[PDB]
């Protein structure tokens, strides 16, 4: 194949490797990087659902603090927005849940 997607690829690039492994990014993404590609953090991180005990800590680290009872309510309605069986909720979905709330 022109692109070698069946070679298992090496973990360390040999600085002079001339073949493709199927992970090359098309120039469409390179010209307009997906927002946060310059900070080393890629946005397929918000979608991973997280439990309340770490979501709360993340949000007090950001600077948003809510009293208990209020936090369990926002977590439960974020879970309702997610509509998933597991209690863990996505951080982004919890963010839009707060955006709906605060009024």
């Amino acid at each position: 194949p022109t692109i070698r997607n069946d070679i298992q690829k090496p973990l360390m690039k040999s600085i002079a490797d001339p073949n493709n492994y199927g992970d090359e990014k098309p120039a469409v993404n390179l010209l307009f990087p997906k927002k946060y590609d310059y900070m080393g953090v890629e946005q397929d991180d918000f979608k991973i659902k997280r439990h309340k005990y770490e979501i709360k800590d993340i949000f007090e680290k950001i600077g948003y603090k809510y009293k208990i009872g209020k936090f369990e309510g926002i977590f439960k309605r974020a879970q309702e927005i997610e509509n998933s069986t597991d209690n863990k909720v996505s951080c982004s979905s919890f963010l839009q849940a707060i955006q709906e709330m605060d009024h």
Binding site: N20, E24, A27, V28, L30, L31
Partner: peptide, 22 residues
């Protein structure tokens, strides 16, 4: 440009069109 700056191994007509469009 594709071989030197962006350093992508497999340029295609889509990438050149995208650069021109930008």
């Amino acid at each position: 440009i594709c071989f030197r700056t962006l350093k992508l191994t497999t340029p295609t007509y889509g990438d050149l069109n995208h650069l021109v469009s930008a």
